[PDB]
Design a protein around this ligand. Structure first.
Ligand code: S6V
Ligand code: S6V
Lengths: 348, 348, 348, 348, 348
């Protein structure tokens, strides 16, 4: 028996929806859900979504609390809907998907993914739940994650990191690295080779390789010498050029991280969502150098070096395409006399 | 298991809350409650109250659907709260009372009126419900209505009319005339002798005596002859004086009713609530005569004639106290040379 | 170049969206759309829907302004979505359908109904628009209306009336009677033989046969004689029984219409939507007789007489299925000793 | 000491703001102002404006409650702001003007109209208020109304009607016909000779000449004979052509009034504001004839007859400028072979 | 003379309500109070409460700005209402109590606590205000704080810390340690022996004893050896077990504080209010260990040790009750073979 008051009961007593019976008094004012605790109202939930406040409250309560793929991964794989769960998008404070399957009466399109209305949609299946590797088998379109091998299917090994209650982390007490599988029109796909973004914070940035350690601890000239990077324009692309009104380059998160230790800057996240490439309007506080659209990606520096060192440097400009987080990321590569001028995620 | 979706279920299938089991999907957006019917949202309730939308919805659904006293009566008797029901105020689209007893977990101050929190409050009891005469006897403060005699309790015969789902009516297939009883500080009170207002509309006004049919079809001069009203200023008080910019008199609803059939006028109900005396800012459309605060009362003309003729006409001005709807209504009486100049419900 | 200000321009200059170029300044505050006219804001639209205010505004502006089927018809035929138009539901002040095709960039699931996302949806097609008969033929699921014959397609003659800008009417300068066609899973379906509800108002009800003029001017006993209705309980079913607290019968709109001319009553439309059978919580103002769920249908009395006389009167109770507005309407038939006790649209 | 609670006090006790001292408790929730009356909240004001709720409340309370020009007049004269009063626009439920002078601390641009910020604005002055004729003389831009002669100032006799608390009326106990005066750039302007619209309702329309009683009771053919209107196309312009899907003509309010008594129609007021010419999207309920933009004007039929007969009928099409309500109203005149085809307020 | 504008004047000029005369212009839009400073609007207050925005604005303005008991203390002592002040709940951004006494017209139940409507309520009295120790004397139910002894009453010495404008602190320039007294039904109570929570921040945590210094600076094994804590399971209860999917133990704030220095984690405060035991849904960023309901209490480690060392360790599981902040806190104690397995504030 689904009810606003029982959803609130679960939130209050179990920290999320947990199928427990019970009711607490609830009041809804504008976009906020309150409950009464000893005669005073206590806020349980502020609706930041475009859904009705009580609907969004229920979907948030029923969010998946196990490590799940980051939304950018799901989006890049074309996932339209999840099977019997809600992937909560913590970057948008909203459900990652419009509709649900067997979750909520206001948003459900079906109780089970085997219903035909689900056949065209790419359904997310979680092999850690009994019976869902088998539902993927009968599913026309879908994406499946597992922790171990699936007899009859070659896996695509995903990123090391997953999202646990909006914290992106590499699990040590839980597994966050999944096998990925995908089916389009009943056919198991071969997922492409792909790099993975590292999903790190500017504030909490930690190197994950000796080259990244070398990048953070060495001066610019030393690092470029040690990894034989003359002519690839890391001065511009990675370190950043702060001498002109328009900030130069600075497209790799580790380069922002290094700069942030020395002097601060504003990153305006004008499309706040999870995505492989992030666009920021950045203002450098020390110099006043700024750029309206500064595309930023968090690649392992190692991976970025391999990408730029695997390009032909003999044309003035061209589009370079790189599979990242399973999607095709277009870069612009600009060269002159056989050296790199700039190289950036294309602003398209 | 009380819930928003169960309240909405009852509204959809039963027209109001009826204790039935069931749920329907509900979405709340701003102050409106919707439910899904074949994929589209249908409005069930627009919150016009100062309570949270889902709370007001529940109280409205749980409104008393039997004939009940008009809110003006309950207010005049000092009613603060109702025992195990909601008196819906259809003139304010809101509960007549702030709190409940045994109705709603958000507004309940108690489950039963015997709880000591209810002792200082004047609780409304309905003798048509098993056990509530006894609860009145045990209550420190209360008002009781019954359809018949309560042994030992001296009754007060109430108005003929009651409110059935916002419709004020004199019952024929149902009983609307109750005995009234009141207790203050554990002690039953004598209810005063009283007139009752008739609760008629301006649009569909109907006379209720030979005098009132006479007033509506006789011209002003022949009516005043026949009922020997010379010197009592019904020309001003009842018929209304539209010759000056300030509209004169016009304090009896029947007088407004006579005028309305001839030429229309505007009545701004600037304090929209049920009360024994109503105040309107009135604008005569024919003449442009107007008055910011025109107090209007709907007495049977008979009763008004009795009241005014009862009066000493030998003082210039004096307050005249008349008991109407159990409350004491002050009138201003202005005389000169043994005749009435004006007589109107005193503006406070 | 589609835009809010261009939609508002069309509304101001053309009365609705008309493809014209232009812009007017618009301000949006809460659910209201305003435009500046000589320095002051003028309301263009109040959002009563569950869509965002500017989206609802655009859909309303793009509403079909030709005669279209009443929403109850489209619902009864399973219509999910309209091809390249908006059917505005004037009884809900909202779009009849959640999504659009080729109307609005926020609600479009497709630009053209041939897109595969539309295949499982029953698409409404309008043969008066070039190319939409062909799109119906190619659609997996659909409902089509036409003004004339479609070669090979067996037609169903629809109701005489259609909705023109929220006004239900039988056209004289325009055609409102359409042929109807329906496809399920690629296969054209036989539409059933059916009665049609008459879609009349209680206030401005007008008879449409000699029987109906007879009902309105004959007294109850002489009408029942003349049409040999003894034992069929029109005293209860149609005329209504106001003698007890629960209002008896009164399930034909014409019966409500007869009563209304005598004495008024309240009809709470607690599920305000277009449907073949309406449910009202009704309160008779004269008697106080009332009923929480009074199902009402507007059949031509002729048709209702035909239906009830068609029935076997030899069982105590049974469900009786009648096709009305293309949907199957269950009635409860209660008999005793070969005469009718009651007969009413079954409450579900 | 100006305050929200003092404004509310005046509304409760005086029907509007009246300078009285006092306070009542007020609660504001969304756009609604409430006050406490015996423990329950009573709505005083619903904000329909684009101003903050408490500001709109104060301006509404301080509305001019004397007869004032209709907003269409003030707009046609270029009035931007009022001197020390609020002209409430009852057709928009909003102030007629954005800013105030000496009314409200949130909307005041000045305390007195002599302040230089007011010089470029056309200030409305009311000669019935001490000192405002003089303020008009000193104002750079202004419009003045008076009840009598102003020495030296050549008057313009205004319409018979004015607006008293939203009621448009020709005064009998009050004066509603004013002299009008206007100043632009310090220089008094000649106001033009002008017709005036009659400002009548469709529902309660009343004729105001022998011609207009003739139009309402004569059939179309005998009226057109008697007033020798052959060849002037009142069949189209005034009576209206309901035979085709596009409703023909019907541009005089009296013509709509004649039709309305026969059969109803819908008038969507899609730009709801006071103006000399109104535009309606009209749907004839009887025929289904409709028109997206039907311009309607309420001229005395006499005046309209005078206007159309004044015209040269020897050109196919031409713009015809007529001064109405002081503004210049363009008509389209379409002729053929020396007779009128159509004549309508030109859509801009 | 109370007014919205004078409340705003005090906020602008005195930083809070201070009884000063004056007015500033105010606009209220949705839940926000603005004032005009040189022609632009400046936000004064965003309503986060369930009260009307202007009411909450006034109660916030009139908040107590002296050190006051933390709300958890007041709640645990059953305080229903404060005498002539507002205890602002900074954890809920709301009044700590529904109603007021002599503070605000919309929420006052009385001007003085001696009124009889206050007799059943437990009223908070502040001995630092003239006359309130005496009002407590005549009060039926109440709680009283003082800075010094009260002749005739044995005190309960409260916590060292109090709340000054939402900052919990141990006063050095002001006294924050109060004497507590309580009366139920006219009888001065003996307040129980009690521990006190320390009310510290995870970010700003400072030790308040040598044992707490030892806990933060020593490694786990050393600390447990030094204070002879083998067998009491501080490894689990205090330090936390981060090796399993479900985070183990971690119920004492100092243990969270120690962990936060090394590596960060998310504490989701899903019931944001002041209370003796806090429930968090915690996600450890380093490991991915998490727990839906992790009850946390900030006891002086010393105090926690004394509690756990004063329990019988010879039953598998039982409820341990400890008076903390004057309320009864139930703990669950789990043992095996005479040693502690876990010990946590009971999730009930
Ligand atoms: O699903 C799988 N093959 C697609 C099966 N088909 C045939 C055509 C329609 C359809 O769905 N294979 C699979 C096997 C083990 C584990 C998970 C998946
Ligand atoms: O209040 C006090 N005793 C309760 C007095 N009673 C008797 C029964 C009713 C009632 O209230 N005592 C007290 C003395 C000094 C300072 C503060 C308090």
């Amino acid at each position: 028996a689904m009810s606003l008051e029982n959803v609130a009961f679960n939130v209050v007593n179990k920290g999320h929806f947990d199928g427990q019976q019970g009711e607490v008094p609830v009041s809804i004012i504008n976009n906020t859900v309150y409950t009464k605790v000893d005669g005073v109202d206590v806020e349980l939930f502020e609706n930041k979504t475009t859904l009705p406040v009580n609907v969004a409250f229920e979907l948030w309560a029923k969010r998946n609390i196990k490590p799940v793929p980051e939304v950018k991964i799901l989006n890049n794989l074309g996932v339209d809907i999840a099977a019997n769960t809600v992937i909560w998008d913590y970057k948008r404070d909203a459900p990652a998907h419009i509709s649900t399957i067997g979750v909520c009466s206001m948003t459900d399109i079906a109780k089970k993914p085997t219903e035909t209305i689900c056949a065209p949609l790419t359904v997310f299946f979680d092999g850690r739940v009994d019976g869902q590797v088998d539902l993927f088998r009968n599913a026309r379109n879908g994406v499946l994650i597992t922790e171990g091998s699936v007899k009859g299917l070659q896996p695509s090994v995903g990123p090391k990191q997953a999202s646990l209650n909006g914290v992106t982390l590499i699990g040590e007490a839980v597994k966050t690295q999944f096998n990925y599988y995908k089916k389009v029109d009943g056919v198991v796909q071969q997922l492409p080779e792909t790099y993975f973004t590292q999903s790190r914070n500017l504030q909490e940035f930690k190197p994950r390789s000796q080259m990244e350690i070398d990048f953070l601890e060495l001066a610019m000239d030393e690092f470029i010498e040690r990894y034989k990077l003359e002519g690839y324009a890391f001065e511009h692309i990675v370190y950043g050029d702060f001498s002109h009104s328009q900030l130069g380059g600075l497209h790799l998160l580790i380069g922002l991280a290094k700069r942030f230790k020395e002097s601060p800057f504003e990153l305006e996240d004008f499309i706040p969502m999870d995505s492989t490439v992030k666009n920021y309007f950045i203002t450098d506080a020390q110099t006043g150098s700024s750029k309206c659209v500064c595309s930023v990606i968090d690649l392992l520096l190692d991976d970025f070096v391999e990408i730029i060192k695997s390009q032909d440097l003999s044309v003035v400009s061209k589009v370079v395409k790189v599979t990242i987080d399973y999607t095709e990321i277009s870069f612009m590569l600009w060269c002159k006399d056989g050296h790199v001028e700039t190289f950036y995620p294309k602003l398209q």
